């Protein structure tokens, strides 16, 4: 299917080298910062456990399988396909969904076009198990596309069909309707690929065959041509080694179609592909450092499930907003998930969560939308959570925990908690700065004049007397001068890698000399930072025998910036 439409004149070919030579992560994704994920489908009718109800109900002995036999009947009489007539979606309204999405301040929406269960939520000739001919009997993706255009947001979608090749594997080991191979809804019924976590290693089982890869291409191209989304989200098994040649065929056609659309698109994968040819995404987790290329965090308002389920513990607005600012400060964007009820009603708790984020963004949005990272992302005591599947832990921040964003040379310092006293922005200490002059200090949403004092330890900022908002509190700082970040170290063979960021806040160009002395080995570099800009600087020290026992010193224009005496 991919090798049929591709021409020798197309810009993108089905390999990573061809993508890197012509694709660039678009500016709208860097500026959007906030998006809304929506898990909603046939799995919402039982609303038990999670959206993995379709897989576990066919594994004999699993709690969901024993739950399904007593609640709905034996697997040979009531399979997953029998939930579809109950999926009427009597209270679904695309405008109501977008009104809630727009209320949250989000800039794009990502509904689920098809999950692992093999049920398409759109007008599909390829898949007879679609939402137009059965269930809701309407084009859910098409109606959400028109509602998104009327709301002024950008339309994306997510595809999970890659896992459909093995999601119903347990239906073959127990008498069920999955053993009826005439039902294409249940996929290829192969074994799940091995390798725990986000790894391309698959081992004994491929997780896909040559037929499911053919269907994946026709499935993705049906979403590309019918709805022309500006972003497509994929789940984890697309990154497996046997599936990568097939996925590169999609990326070449998707990007080539975007050139004809006069639009710029984004592809989301959780592993297996370079940070520069697509937007890396972490499930229920964020990064601890600033990443060079834009990335995304996808997480659910509910702690247990993505789709709706009885007894879901939803996250607090402060939990999400504290993590949202942390994600944005590291060049990441948040894809927050909501799980509507089976009839299409978004719960009151998840509407209040999105509303509080929008109310907080209405006041502090200037430090989020269109912003970029500063020289350093965070400062303070608590570093917060980071990594795959660590979002549920809420970090208890104080006012001394500060996140940084920059936009149009302005500096934004976000305190993740409130205080009636003062904090000191240690990142502006005299050892990091050269001729830094503070021009104005401002808290977004407050009419009070902020008292500040520049010291050698940093910029002391006194909080106002009345909170503009809760959750997080933003200081807008206008300044000139050159600021360096505290260096971070990584391990290499017989040496170490030193990474710093330099921000020139002056209106004219500046020459900067950086020196790193590790274990006596001295390496220097001179860099010219243009006016009102930032730059990464990477240096390498040699002849370093013990990384864990290093003696490191970093100098910014012959001034000691960092040392671990
Ligand atoms: O490797 N894993 O065991 C694994 C991998 C992914 C996973 O969640 C995957 O993505 C979520 C959204 O980020 C949901 O769509 C979920 O239904 C899906 O299985 C759940 C478990
Ligand atoms: Ca907070
Ligand atoms: Cl940039
Ligand atoms: Na749109
Ligand atoms: Na197999
Ligand atoms: Na004070
Ligand atoms: Ni919480
Ligand atoms: Ni507060």
**Ligand 5 centroid – CA 190 distance (Å):** 5
- Of 281, 279, 264, 270, nearest in space to 243 by CA: 270
Q: Of all atoms in ligand 1, which is nearest to the CA of residue 235?
A: 10
Q: Which two tokens stand for residue 60?
A: 């004999």
Return the ligand number nearest the Cα of 535. Answer: 3
Give the separation between CA 383 and CA 364, rounded to whole angstroms. 22
Give the separation between CA 79 and CA 85, rounded to whole angstroms. 12
Return the ligand number nearest the Cα of 455. Answer: 6
Task: Note whether 94 and 144 are within 8 A (CB).
Answer: yes
Burial of 159 (0-12, 13-18, 19+ CB in 10 A): buried
**In 10 A of CB 548, how many CB atoms?**
5
What residue owns the CA closest to ligand 1's atom 21?
197
Task: Note whether 330 and 385 are within 8 A (CB).
Answer: no
Return the ligand number nearest the Cα of 314. Answer: 7
Phi, psi for residue 494 in degrees, rounded to 5: 55, 35
What residue owns the CA closest to ligand 1's atom 2?
197
Q: Which two tokens stand for residue 475?
A: 């200081």
**Ligand 2 centroid – CA 390 distance (Å):** 18
- Of 381, 367, 298, nearest in space to 332 by CA: 298
Give the separation between CA 223 and CA 342, rounded to whole angstroms. 23
**Ligand 1 centroid – CA 493 distance (Å):** 35
Phi, psi for residue 244 in degrees, rounded to 5: -60, -45
Using DSSP, state whether 210 is helix, strand or coil. Answer: helix
Which residue pairs from 221-226 have beta carbons closer than 8 angstroms and sit at least 24 positions apart in sequence? 221/1, 221/2, 221/5, 221/250, 221/253, 222/122, 222/124, 222/125, 222/126, 223/113, 223/122, 223/141, 223/157, 223/159, 224/253, 224/254, 224/257, 225/257, 226/122, 226/123, 226/141, 226/142
Using DSSP, state whether 415 is helix, strand or coil. Answer: strand
**Ligand 4 centroid – CA 149 distance (Å):** 4
List, chain by chain if needed, residues with CB within 6 Å of any ligand 1 atom.
51-52, 160, 235-236, 283, 298, 306
Give the separation between CA 91 and CA 399, rounded to whole angstroms. 43
CA 67 vs. chain centroid, Å, equals: 34
Residue that is written with structure tokens 């925990």 in the block: 401
Residue that is written with structure tokens 């977008």 in the block: 98
Q: 140-151 and 94-103 are packed helices; what angle lies between their axes, rounded to 10 degrees?
A: 50
**Ligand 6 centroid – CA 421 distance (Å):** 7
CB contact burial 226-255 (16+ within 10 A = b; e otherwise): bbebbbbbbbbbbbbbbbeebbbbbbbbbb
Phi, psi for residue 145 in degrees, rounded to 5: -70, -40
For domain 16-367, is the CATH number 3.20.20.80?
A: yes
Give the separation between CA 106 and CA 126, rounded to whole angstroms. 32
Give the separation between CA 341 and CA 99, rounded to whole angstroms. 17
Q: Which two tokens stand for residue 516?
A: 């790193």
Using DSSP, state whether 506 is helix, strand or coil. Answer: coil
What residue owns the CA closest to ligand 1's atom 14?
306
C-alpha distance across the termini of the chain, in Å: 62
Return the ligand number nearest the Cα of 393. Answer: 7
Q: Which two tokens stand for residue 251?
A: 């990326």
Task: Give DSSP secondary structure letters for 246-271.
Answer: HHHHHHHHHHHHHHHHT---EEEESS
Residue that is written with structure tokens 């009104």 in the block: 99
Task: Note whether 397 and 382 are within 8 A (CB).
Answer: yes
Task: Note whether 481 and 435 are within 8 A (CB).
Answer: yes
Q: Which two tokens stand for residue 10?
A: 């197309």
Q: Which residue out of 157, 240, 306 has the highest number of ligand 1 atoms within 8 Å of its CB and is therefore the one to mutate?
A: 306
Q: With residue 323 as reference, give the H or E element that holds it.
A: helix 317-329
Give the separation between CA 287 and CA 388, rounded to whole angstroms. 9
Q: Which residue out of 42, 117, 283, 339 has the highest number of ligand 1 atoms within 8 Å of its CB and is therefore the one to mutate?
A: 283
Number of H helices, E strands in the chain: 11, 24
Please report, for residues 135, 159, 248, 465, the alpha-carbon distance to residue 13 in angstroms, rounded to integers and kept in the order given: 38, 22, 8, 59
Give the separation between CA 377 and CA 372, rounded to whole angstroms. 10
CB contact burial 91-121 (16+ within 10 A = b; e otherwise): ebebeebbebbbebbbbbbbbbbbbbbbbbb
Task: Note whether 478 and 410 are within 8 A (CB).
Answer: yes
Give the separation between CA 196 and CA 449, rounded to whole angstroms. 54
Phi, psi for residue 226 in degrees, rounded to 5: -75, -40
DSSP state of 346: P
Pairing of strands 459-462, 422-425: antiparallel
Give the separation between CA 203 and CA 195, rounded to whole angstroms. 7
Q: With residue 113 as reference, give the H or E element that holds it.
A: strand 108-114
CB contact burial 423-457 (16+ within 10 A = b; e otherwise): bbbbbbbebbbbebebeebbbbbbeeebebebeee
Give the separation between CA 297 and CA 333, rounded to whole angstroms. 6
Give the separation between CA 323 and CA 357, rounded to whole angstroms. 12
Q: Which residues are annotated as a binding site for Ca(2+)?
A: 318, 322, 416, 471
- The distance between the two most distant Cα atoms of the chain, rounded to a whole number of Å, is 78
DSSP state of 197: S
Task: Note whether 416 and 397 are within 8 A (CB).
Answer: yes
Residue that is written with structure tokens 């990142």 in the block: 427
Q: Specify the length of the chain in residues.
A: 565
Give the separation between CA 317 and CA 470, rounded to whole angstroms. 9
Using DSSP, state whether 216 is helix, strand or coil. Answer: helix
Residue that is written with structure tokens 């100098």 in the block: 555
Q: Of all atoms in ligand 1, which is nearest to the CA of residue 198?
A: 1
Pairing of strands 279-283, 295-300: parallel
**Ligand 6 centroid – CA 451 distance (Å):** 8
- 281 - beta bridge partners? 296
**Cα three-residue angle 284-287-292, rounded to 5 degrees:** 130
Is the C-alpha dihedral spanning 400, 384, 393, 391 positive or negative? positive
DSSP state of 240: S
Phi, psi for residue 221 in degrees, rounded to 5: -75, -25
Q: Which two tokens stand for residue 283?
A: 């499930």
Q: How are the residues of the chain apportioned to helix, strand and coil, as percentages rounded to the nearest 5?
A: 25, 25, 45
**In 10 A of CB 172, how many CB atoms?**
16
Give the separation between CA 436 and CA 488, rounded to whole angstroms. 23
Breaks (C-N over 2.5 A) in the chain follow: none
Give the separation between CA 368 and CA 276, rounded to whole angstroms. 22
Q: Which two tokens stand for residue 544?
A: 């370093």
Within 13 Å, how many C-alpha atoms sit on residue 504's CB side? Answer: 17
Please report, for residues 11, 23, 149, 229, the alpha-carbon distance to residue 255 in angstroms, rounded to integers and kept in the order given: 9, 8, 21, 11
What residue owns the CA closest to ligand 1's atom 19?
52
- 473 - beta bridge partners? 415
CA 359 vs. chain centroid, Å, equals: 21
What residue owns the CA closest to ligand 1's atom 3?
197
Burial of 280 (0-12, 13-18, 19+ CB in 10 A): buried
Q: With residue 454 as reference, give the H or E element that holds it.
A: strand 452-454
Report residues near ion ligand 6: CB below 5 Å: 422
Please report, for residues 118, 131, 132, the alpha-carbon distance to residue 128 in angstroms, rounded to integers and kept in the order given: 10, 9, 9
Give the separation between CA 336 and CA 318, rounded to whole angstroms. 14
Pairing of strands 552-556, 510-518: antiparallel
């Amino acid at each position: 299917d991919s090798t049929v439409s591709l021409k020798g004149t197309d810009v993108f070919k089905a390999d990573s080298a061809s993508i890197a030579q012509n694709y660039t992560i678009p500016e709208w994704f860097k500026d959007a910062k906030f998006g809304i994920f929506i898990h909603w489908g046939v799995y919402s009718v039982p609303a038990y456990g999670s959206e993995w109800y379709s897989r576990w109900m066919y594994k004999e002995g699993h709690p969901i399988n024993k739950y399904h036999v007593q609640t709905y009947g034996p697997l040979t009489k009531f399979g997953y396909k029998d939930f579809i007539p109950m999926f009427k979606a009597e209270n679904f309204n695309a405008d109501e969904w977008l009104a809630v999405v727009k209320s949250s301040g989000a800039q794009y929406i990502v509904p689920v076009a098809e999950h692992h269960d093999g049920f398409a939520m759109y007008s599909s000739t390829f898949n007879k198990w679609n939402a137009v001919d059965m269930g809701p009997k309407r084009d859910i993706i098409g109606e959400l596309k028109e509602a998104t255009k009327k709301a002024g947001l950008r339309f994306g979608l997510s595809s999970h069909r890659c896992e459909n090749a093995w999601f119903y594997e347990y239906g073959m080991e127990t008498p069920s309707d999955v053993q009826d191979t005439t039902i294409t809804l249940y996929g290829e019924r192969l074994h799940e690929p091995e390798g725990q976590g986000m790894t391309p290693y698959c081992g004994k089982y491929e997780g896909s065959n040559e037929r499911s890869r053919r269907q994946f291409l026709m499935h993705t191209y049906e979403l590309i041509d019918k709805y022309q989304p500006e972003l497509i989200w994929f789940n984890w098994t697309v990154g497996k080694y046997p599936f990568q040649p097939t996925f590169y065929k999609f990326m070449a056609y998707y990007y080539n179609s975007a050139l004809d659309w006069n639009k710029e698109v984004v592809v989301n994968t959780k592993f297996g592909y370079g940070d520069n040819i697509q937007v890396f995404d972490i499930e229920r987790g964020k990064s601890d450092r600033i990443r060079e290329y834009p990335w995304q965090t996808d997480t659910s308002v509910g702690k247990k499930s993505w789709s709706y389920c009885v007894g879901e513990e939803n996250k607090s607005p402060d939990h999400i907003i504290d993590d949202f600012v942390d994600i944005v400060s590291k060049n990441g964007n948040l894809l927050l998930n909501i799980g509507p009820k089976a009839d299409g009603t978004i719960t009151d708790e998840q509407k209040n969560v999105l509303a509080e984020i929008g109310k907080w963004l209405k006041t502090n949005g200037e430090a989020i939308y269109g912003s970029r990272p500063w020289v350093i992302a965070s400062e303070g005591h608590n570093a917060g959570t980071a990594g795959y599947m660590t979002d549920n832990t809420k970090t208890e921040y104080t006012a001394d925990d500060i996140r940084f964003t920059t936009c149009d040379n302005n500096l934004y310092a976000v305190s993740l908690a409130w205080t009636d006293g003062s904090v000191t922005i240690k990142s502006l200490a005299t050892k990091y700065c050269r001729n830094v002059e503070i021009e104005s200090v401002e808290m977004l949403g407050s009419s009070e004049k902020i008292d500040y004092k520049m010291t050698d330890e940093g910029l002391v900022v006194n909080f106002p007397k009345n909170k503009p908002t809760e959750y997080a509190h933003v200081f807008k700082i206008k300044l000139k001068g050159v600021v360096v970040s505290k260096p971070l170290y990584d391990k290499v063979d017989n040496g170490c890698l030193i990474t710093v960021r330099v921000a020139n806040h002056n209106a004219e160009d500046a020459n900067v000399t950086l020196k790193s002395v590790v274990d006596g080995n001295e390496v220097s570099t001179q860099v010219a930072v243009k006016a009102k800009s930032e730059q990464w600087v990477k240096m390498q020290n040699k002849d370093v025998k013990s990384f864990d026992d290093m003696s490191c010193k970093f100098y910014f224009n012959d001034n000691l910036t960092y040392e671990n005496e």
